[PDB]
RNA sequence: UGUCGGCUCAUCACAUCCUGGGGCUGAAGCCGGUCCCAAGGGUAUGGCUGUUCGCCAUUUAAAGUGGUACGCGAGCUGGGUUUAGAACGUCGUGAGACAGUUCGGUCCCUAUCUGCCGUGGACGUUUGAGAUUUGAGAGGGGCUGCUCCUAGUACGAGAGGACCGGAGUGGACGAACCUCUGGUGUUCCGGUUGUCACGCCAGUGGCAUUGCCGGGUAGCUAUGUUCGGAAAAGAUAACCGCUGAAAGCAUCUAAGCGGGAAACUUGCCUCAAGAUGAGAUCUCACUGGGAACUUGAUUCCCCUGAAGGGCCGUCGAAGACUACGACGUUGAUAGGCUGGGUGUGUAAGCGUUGUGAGGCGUUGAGCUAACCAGUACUAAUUGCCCGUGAGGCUUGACCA
RNA sequence: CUUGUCGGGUAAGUUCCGACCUGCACGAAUGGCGUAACGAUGGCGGCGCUGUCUCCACCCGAGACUCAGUGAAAUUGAAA
RNA sequence: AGGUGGUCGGGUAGAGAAUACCAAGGCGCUUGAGAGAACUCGGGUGAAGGAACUAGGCAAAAUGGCACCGUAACUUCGGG
RNA sequence: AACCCACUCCCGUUGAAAAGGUAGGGGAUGACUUGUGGAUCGGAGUGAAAGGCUAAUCAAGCUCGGAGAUAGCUGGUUCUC
RNA sequence: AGGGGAGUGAAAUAGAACCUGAAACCGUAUGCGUACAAGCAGUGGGAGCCUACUUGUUAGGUGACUGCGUACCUUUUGUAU
């Protein structure tokens, strides 16, 4: 099936009112000061104040 | 429904699923630290942890049982000789899983599986 | 399911001797035909079992008058008055459902000497 | 009716009478309930008593809800329920136990049933499927017609379609109490009780009974 | 459970070897007949000099089924084949001797005659 | 604007088929005939035929009559009709034709709007928040047989046989549940065929539909288990009245007072204050300055952001995504680990016996998913973001 | 006309098989009547077998569903 | 996922160039990760019944090899 | 079996495909299948005959001309008082 | 890749897809309106708010509430159809 009348500008923009994106949970590593995702290893290799992967 | 059901299909057949977790456990006992997807990392601890418990008692019966589950001669040698002696007094929980981010290619959540008391 | 185990365990006071599938047992069954009670007898070969505590059951099979009949007994019910093993059979399986297809000399079960 | 207890479904079992019959039984554990508030006509309109049961860690009870549980020296428990009583007296801090029931004593059990996520019309509404052979095209478990032509030319409200076999609340009426264990706080009930194991159930006297 | 077009045999000496259910009696839209339930049959195979002939429509009672009958303690009794007893117009058996075992659910006020004639009752 | 019949799913009328209440009877009883009131709930399976229909066979309390594009093909079918092939009978010189037969013959569409079934996001409800609630309104449900007692009584020449009133057990339908009886259980345990590999023997693994099979835990499930329809109240329909005149009588009606049905309003179950008419109860939190004015429900600056909510993480008999529920070290939320349980059915190695296949012992052995109980070994941080600073005015009454 | 009438088969058979003859409107090389073997040919009936069905239940893979990347179609006077 | 002439063609089972597992050799098919709803597609197993389904046993289930024994009407003497 | 064919079901129908696929199916030493080269054609060819085939076109191919055929038939026909 | 400066030029919003550079279509910013309201979306009436300035018998933007109101073409005896 297909539309009988084309949708308007307002009709299609009302449908997109639920398309806004969310923001993640970012924490600051207390020892150094790097910003990482919450509950994730730092981009440097730190988690909860400990080297874990040494790059 | 799937009330009180255990396991993950992971879009693979049973033979594929069983064969993939043998490779991961065999690689883990050799490198001590691997990077995989988070859902796969959580299904691996139900395979690689019962193998370390089995190696705490060394006998012909146990090594044959371990070789039937990890068909790798080096992994049976690594167990019974390095692990199981290192973890001789650990009441379970021999591996640690840490979220590390998402892959560039498809945005899949990744993880770091490692052994708890690595020599590093 | 920890306080279920205690409600059921205080009704588990019978003797229930040890027996296994393939054995020939005789079951004494309480029977009514009005006001007078009596103990009927069921004799057959055990083909199945179920070890679930109070919810245990077993199945025996007999040929009555040319017709085979199977009865499933609740072990801890007051109906099952007593049970005695008449002969010990030697089988490799746990459920002898294949015996339903065999009739005469084909359905013999080797006796367990010791 | 009008006064009962809140318990937890423990599971099903059986008990054997002396005469050999077996009674299918659902075990219900009723830890003693604590009267939290008494509602009267001159304060609230209707008339009822409010009840709490269980145990709650102090870090999960909020400040507003803790001062409510402290007006009556009751201590916080999981959940709060209200029983609309007819003509009864209960002071704040009282105890309500299984000891208000006897054997015989038809009772009504209210619970929240198991949830089947999103069900089709065969499972939900007991429809009957079309052919599995004889030429049917990809239309085996589908509903079929859902209306008529130009007249109405719309689907009537309340039509039976698919979706969410509920985890809703239901009551099973006229269930017989087989045994009441005062010391172990148990309530053995003949029949089946809605919900899964470990869920909250409300047990009240039979609404109808009569015969 | 017995429904229409189930082939069940005969536990009498009336003349039939093989009857077939054509109606389950005692209710609108009734589906199955258990042990002790009245059905309407037709005779598919007979004996040359018996007292029923092939193609006869008549009533019967189910006395033996593979599905079985439960008891109050939870037990079940199952047989290896479905059997029936043919009846005349007064709900009374036609044959004079009864083969095989029967059960105690026939001990009603209207079927005690076939309980007496049976070699064994379970 | 796709045309018969079947299937799935329905919705309304009453000119009622059954169940319910009555008047008359050429109504003795058990049965009926006919008319009135009543739409709550029910209201066959098959053989033949493309059939609707019909006729048969066996049931049922009964197998209602109609409207809805003769309801329903962007829901299914394609047997019939109504394209192209071929044949028969009949008609025509012929091409061909026949509400005359016979065999064969492609059924497309990812749902924008209304509608309907579920489920969320925003805002409002006049400070905000945690929790419990009343009920305007709406929906679901409402069927019924047989046997026994009363009683072989009332009725009747006899045969035959009740009303009213009580007990029991079923059929169909619905809901919940998994203790029992079974089903399934490619995540558990065994047997076995062909072949390849692990150096080789033993022992195991891959592939062959899970290779083929025998069993089977949890969960899900019916064919398994339990429960339901009511009683009762109010106002009534037809109908039956009491008292009573207009109209000395009679008369249920004109004034007045009653009885009365599965229909109507409650009683039973569920949803329900977006019921903008946004209700009620308990408890909790917040008690700083300065400036500019277009001079009060005003605007800006600094300080202070509580009660609480969310993000995040471990998950769940909750689930399409959400939402909902439990928990986050002062922790048993998940995995492991330690015991038990359950299922399968006497592992491997070794020792004996035999020439070997095999048997026997160590040995109900070994293994054992989802189950029960305990235990911080592993993962639930050492955070961030929203949400503020006592809640306008007018009038009345009690305080001051 | 017509589901002709009689018989067989089935609890019940507008189809099938055997007959009768009233052949609307058979008929002898647009051949008549038979016929073993043959047929992805039409009709009817049995045995075995079964999820075709009563009446569906569970399980396994691929979609559908969520996320990251690429990215159509028929249709459309305008739409509170 | 179509069509395209000819040649070579190993081991173990096997009548075989069928079929199963492999060799020499070649490849994992140019979106992936999750979750584990209705419904659709391709399959596995089902209690009691066994064509009651339907225009119609459509589809599915079943049979299936080698040796030996045994085999009807009918027949164009071959057969069946 | 290879090879040639196309009887049934389902899927697909905006297809992987302007005629396929998976399961079953028929012939398979012959009136067989097939490669290369050659011959016959538009009122003409070829046809174990279906009005079938003659370059995804057939009760008379395609292409360019007569040609802007003809259309008592549909549609459309533009600024102001 | 593309940009921010700096240089050339009378002029780079003449910068190489380079004169002018419209409309459909897609954005950012400001003012007012909009979450108890039913329909060809306009018009008659009309409050409040915002801006400008000749400070309200003025100009511009918005339009709460309300009466009336079923597009255009064609073809027709007749179309919201
Ligand atoms: Mg339109
Ligand atoms: Mg239109
Ligand atoms: Mg916009
Ligand atoms: Mg969107
Ligand atoms: Mg779980
Ligand atoms: Mg496999
Ligand atoms: Mg669920
Ligand atoms: Mg059906
Ligand atoms: Mg069909
Ligand atoms: Mg199709
Ligand atoms: Mg299909
Ligand atoms: Mg409906
Ligand atoms: Mg007959
Ligand atoms: Mg109406
Ligand atoms: Mg009427
Ligand atoms: Mg009626
Ligand atoms: Mg009536
Ligand atoms: Mg009457
Ligand atoms: Mg009457
Ligand atoms: Mg009606
Ligand atoms: Mg009605
Ligand atoms: Mg009705
Ligand atoms: Mg009512
Ligand atoms: Mg009929
Ligand atoms: Mg037919
Ligand atoms: Mg009509
Ligand atoms: Mg009609
Ligand atoms: Mg119609
Ligand atoms: Mg109709
Ligand atoms: Mg339609
Ligand atoms: Mg269709
Ligand atoms: Mg149709
Ligand atoms: Mg349509
Ligand atoms: Mg269509
Ligand atoms: Mg469709
Ligand atoms: Mg067809
Ligand atoms: Mg047709
Ligand atoms: Mg033709
Ligand atoms: Mg002629
Ligand atoms: Mg054909
Ligand atoms: Mg036809
Ligand atoms: Mg269609
Ligand atoms: Mg939609
Ligand atoms: Mg539209
Ligand atoms: Mg619309
Ligand atoms: Mg109400
Ligand atoms: Mg409303
Ligand atoms: Mg109602
Ligand atoms: Mg209703
Ligand atoms: Mg008499
Ligand atoms: Mg039922
Ligand atoms: Mg069960
Ligand atoms: Mg169980
Ligand atoms: Mg069982
Ligand atoms: Mg079982
Ligand atoms: Mg099983
Ligand atoms: Mg089970
Ligand atoms: Mg080798
Ligand atoms: Mg070997
Ligand atoms: Mg092998
Ligand atoms: Mg291999
Ligand atoms: Mg298998
Ligand atoms: Mg096989
Ligand atoms: Mg159910
Ligand atoms: Mg008077
Ligand atoms: Mg009077
Ligand atoms: Mg009056
Ligand atoms: Mg009254
Ligand atoms: Mg009443
Ligand atoms: Mg009733
Ligand atoms: Mg009504
Ligand atoms: Mg509110
Ligand atoms: Mg409120
Ligand atoms: Mg806080
Ligand atoms: Mg909360
Ligand atoms: Mg979840
Ligand atoms: Mg364990
Ligand atoms: Mg065990
Ligand atoms: Mg051993
Ligand atoms: Mg083994
Ligand atoms: Mg041994
Ligand atoms: Mg021993
Ligand atoms: Mg502890
Ligand atoms: Mg005719
Ligand atoms: Mg005829
Ligand atoms: Mg005939
Ligand atoms: Mg037929
Ligand atoms: Mg004939
Ligand atoms: Mg001649
Ligand atoms: Mg001639
Ligand atoms: Mg001719
Ligand atoms: Mg002729
Ligand atoms: Mg001839
Ligand atoms: Mg002939
Ligand atoms: Mg041929
Ligand atoms: Mg038949
Ligand atoms: Mg699936
Ligand atoms: Mg996407
Ligand atoms: Mg080879
Ligand atoms: Mg091959
Ligand atoms: Mg190689
Ligand atoms: Mg994928
Ligand atoms: Mg399927
Ligand atoms: Mg199968
Ligand atoms: Mg199995
Ligand atoms: Mg079956
Ligand atoms: Mg069976
Ligand atoms: Mg059979
Ligand atoms: Mg039929
Ligand atoms: Mg039928
Ligand atoms: Mg077939
Ligand atoms: Mg098959
Ligand atoms: Mg070829
Ligand atoms: Mg051809
Ligand atoms: Mg064809
Ligand atoms: Mg074909
Ligand atoms: Mg197939
Ligand atoms: Mg072939
Ligand atoms: Mg093929
Ligand atoms: Mg041949
Ligand atoms: Mg040429
Ligand atoms: Mg030429
Ligand atoms: Mg030409
Ligand atoms: Mg022709
Ligand atoms: Mg030609
Ligand atoms: Mg062509
Ligand atoms: Mg021409
Ligand atoms: Mg030309
Ligand atoms: Mg022209
Ligand atoms: Mg000219
Ligand atoms: Mg015009
Ligand atoms: Mg102009
Ligand atoms: Mg410019
Ligand atoms: Mg340009
Ligand atoms: Mg110039
Ligand atoms: Mg330019
Ligand atoms: Mg522009
Ligand atoms: Mg804006
Ligand atoms: Mg309103
Ligand atoms: Mg408003
Ligand atoms: Mg509107
Ligand atoms: Mg409107
Ligand atoms: Mg206006
Ligand atoms: Mg104006
Ligand atoms: Mg103005
Ligand atoms: Mg207006
Ligand atoms: Mg208007
Ligand atoms: Mg026009
Ligand atoms: Mg016209
Ligand atoms: Mg006209
Ligand atoms: Mg209109
Ligand atoms: Mg229009
Ligand atoms: Mg008009």
Swiss-Prot record, chain A:
GO BP terms: translation
Keyword 4Fe-4S assigned: no
The organism's place on the tree of life at top rank: Bacteria
Protein's gene: rpmF
Annotated source species: Pseudomonas aeruginosa (strain ATCC 15692 / DSM 22644 / CIP 104116 / JCM 14847 / LMG 12228 / 1C / PRS 101 / PAO1)
Gene Ontology molecular function terms on file: structural constituent of ribosome
UniProt keywords, alphabetically: Ribonucleoprotein, Ribosomal protein
One GO cellular component term: cytosolic large ribosomal subunit
Cystine residue pairs: none
Name of this protein: Large ribosomal subunit protein bL32
Listed InterPro entries: Ribosomal_bL32, Ribosomal_bL32_bact, Ribosomal_zn-bd
Region (Disordered): 1-55
Entry-linked PANTHER family: 50S RIBOSOMAL PROTEIN L32, LARGE RIBOSOMAL SUBUNIT PROTEIN BL32
Family: Belongs to the bacterial ribosomal protein bL32 family.
Compositional bias of kind Basic and acidic residues: 10-21
From Swiss-Prot, chain B:
GO biological process assignments: translation
Keyword Ribonucleoprotein: yes
Top-level taxonomic group: Bacteria
Family matches, as PROSITE patterns: RIBOSOMAL_L17
Record keyword Ribonucleoprotein present: yes
Keywords for the protein's UniProt record, in alphabetical order: Ribonucleoprotein, Ribosomal protein
Example of a GO MF term: structural constituent of ribosome
Single GO cellular component term: cytosolic large ribosomal subunit
NCBIfam families on file: L17
Subunit (UniProt): Part of the 50S ribosomal subunit. Contacts protein L32.
Homology family: Belongs to the bacterial ribosomal protein bL17 family.
Protein name per the record: Large ribosomal subunit protein bL17
Protein's organism: Pseudomonas aeruginosa (strain ATCC 15692 / DSM 22644 / CIP 104116 / JCM 14847 / LMG 12228 / 1C / PRS 101 / PAO1)
From Swiss-Prot, chain D:
This protein's record includes keyword Ribosomal protein: yes
GO cellular component, one term: cytosolic large ribosomal subunit
SUPFAM superfamilies linked: Translation proteins
GO-annotated biological processes: translation
Processing and modification events after translation: Methylated by PrmB.
Record keywords, A-Z: Methylation, Ribonucleoprotein, Ribosomal protein, RNA-binding, rRNA-binding
Gene Ontology terms, MF aspect: rRNA binding; structural constituent of ribosome
N5-methylglutamine, modified sites: 150
Highest rank taxon of the organism: Bacteria
The UniProt record lists the keyword Metal-binding: no
InterPro entries on file: Ribosomal_uL3 (IPR000597), Ribosomal_uL3_bac/org-type (IPR019927), Ribosomal_uL3_CS (IPR019926), Transl_B-barrel_sf (IPR009000)
Family per record: Belongs to the universal ribosomal protein uL3 family.
Record text on subunit structure and interactions: Part of the 50S ribosomal subunit. Forms a cluster with proteins L14 and L19.
Function: One of the primary rRNA binding proteins, it binds directly near the 3'-end of the 23S rRNA, where it nucleates assembly of the 50S subunit.
Protein name: Large ribosomal subunit protein uL3
Record lineage: Bacteria, Pseudomonadati, Pseudomonadota, Gammaproteobacteria, Pseudomonadales
Gene: rplC
UniProtKB/Swiss-Prot annotation, chain E:
GO function term, MF aspect, one: large ribosomal subunit rRNA binding
Keyword Ribonucleoprotein: yes
PANTHER family: 50S/60S RIBOSOMAL PROTEIN L14/L23, LARGE RIBOSOMAL SUBUNIT PROTEIN UL14M
A GO-annotated cellular component: cytosolic large ribosomal subunit
GO biological process: translation
Entry keywords, A to Z: Ribonucleoprotein, Ribosomal protein, RNA-binding, rRNA-binding
PROSITE patterns: RIBOSOMAL_L14 (PS00049)
Annotated family: Belongs to the universal ribosomal protein uL14 family.
Position of the signal peptide: none
Alphabetical list of SUPFAM superfamilies matching this protein: Ribosomal protein L14 (SSF50193)
Pfam family membership, one: Ribosomal_L14
CDD domains linked: Ribosomal_uL14
UniProt keyword annotation of Ribosomal protein present: yes
The protein's name in its UniProt record: Large ribosomal subunit protein uL14
Subunit structure: Part of the 50S ribosomal subunit. Forms a cluster with proteins L3 and L19. In the 70S ribosome, L14 and L19 interact and together make contacts with the 16S rRNA in bridges B5 and B8.
InterPro entries found in the cross-reference section: Ribosomal_uL14, Ribosomal_uL14_bac-type, Ribosomal_uL14_CS, Ribosomal_uL14_sf
Organism annotation: Pseudomonas aeruginosa (strain ATCC 15692 / DSM 22644 / CIP 104116 / JCM 14847 / LMG 12228 / 1C / PRS 101 / PAO1)
Family annotation (HAMAP family): Ribosomal_uL14
Role noted for this protein: Binds to 23S rRNA. Forms part of two intersubunit bridges in the 70S ribosome.
């Amino acid at each position: 099936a297909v539309q009988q009348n084309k949708k308007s500008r307002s009709a299609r923009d009302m449908r997109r009112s639920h398309d806004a994106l969310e923001s993640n949970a970012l924490s600051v590593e207390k020892s150094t000061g790097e910003v990482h995702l919450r509950h994730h290893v730092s981009p440097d290799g730190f988690y909860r104040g400990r080297k874990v992967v040494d790059k | 429904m799937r009330h009180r059901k255990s396991g993950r299909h992971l879009s693979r057949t049973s033979a594929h699923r069983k064969a993939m977790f043998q490779n991961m456990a065999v690689s883990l006992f050799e490198h001590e630290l691997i990077k995989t997807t988070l859902p796969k990392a959580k299904e691996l601890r139900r395979v690689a942890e019962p193998l370390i418990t089995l190696a705490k008692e060394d006998s012909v019966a146990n090594r044959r049982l371990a070789f039937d589950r990890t068909r790798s001669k080096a992994a049976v040698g690594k167990l019974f000789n390095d692990l199981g002696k290192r973890y001789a007094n650990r009441p379970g929980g021999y591996l640690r899983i840490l979220k590390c981010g998402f892959r560039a290619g498809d945005n899949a959540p990744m993880a770091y599986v490692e052994l708890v008391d690595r020599p590093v | 399911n920890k306080i279920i185990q205690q409600i059921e365990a205080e009704q588990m006071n019978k003797e229930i001797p040890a027996f296994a599938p393939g054995d020939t047992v005789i079951v004494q069954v309480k029977v009514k035909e009005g006001d007078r009670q009596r103990l009927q007898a069921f004799e057959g070969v055990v083909i199945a079992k179920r070890n679930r505590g109070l919810n245990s059951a077993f199945t025996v099979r007999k040929i009555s008058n040319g017709v085979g009949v199977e009865r499933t007994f609740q072990t801890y019910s007051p109906i099952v008055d007593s049970l005695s093993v008449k002969r010990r059979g030697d089988v490799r399986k746990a459920k002898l459902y294949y015996l339903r297809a065999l009739s005469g000399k084909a359905a013999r079960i080797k006796e367990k000497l010791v | 009716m009008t006064i009962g207890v809140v318990g937890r479904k423990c599971g099903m079992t059986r008990i054997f009478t002396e005469e050999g019959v077996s009674i299918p039984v659902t075990v219900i554990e009723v830890e003693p309930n604590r009267v939290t508030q008494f509602k009267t006509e001159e304060t609230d309109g209707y008339r009822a008593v409010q009840v709490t049961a269980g145990e709650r860690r102090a870090s999960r009870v909020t400040k507003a809800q803790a001062g409510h549980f402290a007006k009556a020296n009751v201590a916080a428990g999981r959940g709060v329920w209200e029983f609309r009583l007819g003509e009864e007296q209960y002071a704040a801090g009282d105890q309500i136990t299984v000891d208000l029931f006897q054997a015989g004593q038809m009772v009504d059990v209210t619970g929240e049933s198991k949830g089947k996520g999103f069900a089709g019309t065969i499972k939900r509404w007991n429809f009957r499927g079309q052919d599995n052979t004889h030429g049917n095209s990809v239309s085996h478990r589908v509903p079929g017609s859902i209306g008529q032509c130009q007249t109405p030319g719309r689907v009537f409200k309340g039509k039976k379609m698919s979706g969410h076999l509920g985890a809703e609340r239901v009551t099973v009426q006229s269930l017989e109490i087989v045994r009441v264990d005062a010391e172990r706080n148990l309530l053995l009930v003949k029949g089946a009780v809605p919900g899964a194991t470990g869920g909250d159930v409300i047990v009240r006297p039979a609404a109808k009974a009569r015969g | 459970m017995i429904q229409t077009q189930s082939m069940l045999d005969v536990a009498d000496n009336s003349g039939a070897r093989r009857v077939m259910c054509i109606k389950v009696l005692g209710g609108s839209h009734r589906r199955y007949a258990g042990i002790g339930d009245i059905i309407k049959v037709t005779v598919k195979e007979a004996i040359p000099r018996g007292k029923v002939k092939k193609g006869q429509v008549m009533t019967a009672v189910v006395v033996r089924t593979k599905h079985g009958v439960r008891r109050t303690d939870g037990s079940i009794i199952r047989f290896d084949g479905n059997a029936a007893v043919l009846l005349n117009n007064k709900q009374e058996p036609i044959g004079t001797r009864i083969f095989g075992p029967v059960t105690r659910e026939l001990r009603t006020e209207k079927f005690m005659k076939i309980v007496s004639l049976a070699p064994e009752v379970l």
